[PDB]
Design an enzyme around this catalytic site. Structure first.
Site, PDB file in Angstrom:
ATOM      1  N   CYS A 193       0.811  -1.213   0.000  1.00  0.00           N
ATOM      2  CA  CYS A 193       0.000   0.000   0.000  1.00  0.00           C
ATOM      3  C   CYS A 193       0.846   1.265   0.000  1.00  0.00           C
ATOM      4  CB  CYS A 193      -0.808   0.007   1.292  1.00  0.00           C
ATOM      5  SG  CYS A 193      -2.579   0.374   1.211  1.00  0.00           S
TER       6      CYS A 193
HETATM    7  C1  E64 Z   1      -3.602   0.580  -0.411  1.00  0.00           C
HETATM    8  C2  E64 Z   1      -3.925  -0.647  -1.172  1.00  0.00           C
HETATM    9  O1  E64 Z   1      -3.131  -1.703  -1.036  1.00  0.00           O
HETATM   10  O2  E64 Z   1      -4.992  -0.626  -1.926  1.00  0.00           O
HETATM   11  C3  E64 Z   1      -4.903   1.180   0.246  1.00  0.00           C
HETATM   12  O3  E64 Z   1      -5.591   0.202   1.120  1.00  0.00           O
HETATM   13  C4  E64 Z   1      -5.860   1.597  -0.864  1.00  0.00           C
HETATM   14  O4  E64 Z   1      -5.365   2.255  -1.859  1.00  0.00           O
HETATM   15  N1  E64 Z   1      -7.188   1.126  -0.823  1.00  0.00           N
HETATM   16  C5  E64 Z   1      -8.304   1.591  -1.802  1.00  0.00           C
HETATM   17  C6  E64 Z   1      -9.725   1.131  -1.277  1.00  0.00           C
HETATM   18  C7  E64 Z   1     -10.362  -0.332  -1.407  1.00  0.00           C
HETATM   19  C8  E64 Z   1      -9.351  -1.410  -1.962  1.00  0.00           C
HETATM   20  C9  E64 Z   1     -11.606  -0.286  -2.374  1.00  0.00           C
HETATM   21  C10 E64 Z   1      -8.309   3.184  -1.993  1.00  0.00           C
HETATM   22  O5  E64 Z   1      -9.226   3.761  -2.662  1.00  0.00           O
HETATM   23  N2  E64 Z   1      -7.341   3.914  -1.386  1.00  0.00           N
HETATM   24  C11 E64 Z   1      -7.636   4.984  -0.328  1.00  0.00           C
HETATM   25  C12 E64 Z   1      -8.127   4.428   1.068  1.00  0.00           C
HETATM   26  C13 E64 Z   1      -9.542   3.792   0.890  1.00  0.00           C
HETATM   27  C14 E64 Z   1     -10.660   4.663   1.513  1.00  0.00           C
HETATM   28  N3  E64 Z   1     -11.384   3.931   2.564  1.00  0.00           N
HETATM   29  C15 E64 Z   1     -12.192   2.846   2.368  1.00  0.00           C
HETATM   30  N4  E64 Z   1     -12.797   2.279   3.432  1.00  0.00           N
HETATM   31  N5  E64 Z   1     -12.404   2.324   1.116  1.00  0.00           N
END
Ligand code: E64
Length: 214
Positions: A193
């Protein structure tokens, strides 16, 4: 700071090790203990012979522990945290875990190593434990990815729909595994991430068959 962070993980790593020794068979007490520190600590992930040996977090959202360690202090490397959607008690088909990759042999830097078959060979199993049981992660796929979804699917529609996921996961792997997964088995995904708003089409993903050994 940058060395106090190692101090904390050191302390905790040593603490966890003794707990896993005092109670041994029992896992319920090891985590009821870690929960005093922080109620959001829902598990532990460890890979022997490497620096992958940390507690796993879970908050209301997927950015709650992005930049927070287990005692809720701000840190660029945050914590290793489970998807806010996943279930602790009864696992989903796919349990997602996230963690940083800043390149200093901490958190999820070790995931990159699984891109090499050699390394995969010497590290076919990863330990995962929580308040409800001991589990063994059987790695069967490792790859780099640009997409941000699909491999982030908690539960599925049906065996056909899930079968595809496993098939693609296998097809995407850059390492040969003798493991065997099915629509029966439950899986765990480990993904790197980047900080929030830190654009980067480069992510490393590791998928394993989840075996409850307790
Ligand atoms: C890093 C990763 O490995 O994806 C981080 O968790 C991320 O980028 N996640 C995605 C969200 C989900 C996989 C749909 C994202 O949009 N990044 C920002 C944080 C997410 C916002 N919070 C939630 N609860 N979706």
């Amino acid at each position: 700071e940058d060395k106090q962070e190692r101090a904390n993980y050191e302390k905790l790593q040593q603490k966890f090790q003794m707990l896993m020794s005092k109670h041994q068979a029992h896992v319920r007490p090891q985590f009821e203990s870690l929960e005093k520190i922080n109620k959001d600590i829902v598990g532990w992930i460890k890979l022997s012979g490497t620096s992958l040996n940390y507690p796993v977090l879970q908050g209301k959202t997927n950015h709650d522990y992005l930049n927070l360690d287990f005692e809720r202090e701000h840190r660029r490397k945050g914590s290793i945290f489970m998807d806010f959607r996943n279930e602790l008690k009864n696992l989903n088909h796919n349990t997602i875990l996230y963690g940083h990759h800043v390149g200093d042999n901490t958190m999820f830097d070790v995931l990159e190593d699984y891109l090499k078959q050699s390394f995969y060979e010497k590290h076919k199993i990863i330990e995962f434990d929580n308040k409800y049981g001991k589990y063994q992660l059987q790695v069967f796929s490792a790859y780099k990815t640009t997409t941000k979804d699909n491999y982030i699917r908690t539960d599925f529609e049906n065996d056909q729909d899930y079968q595809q996921f496993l098939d693609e996961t296998k097809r995407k792997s850059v390492i040969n595994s003798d493991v065997n997964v099915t629509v029966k088995d439950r899986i765990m995904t480990l993904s790197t991430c980047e900080d929030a708003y830190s654009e980067t089409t480069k992510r490393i993903v590791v998928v394993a068959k989840i075996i409850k050994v307790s």
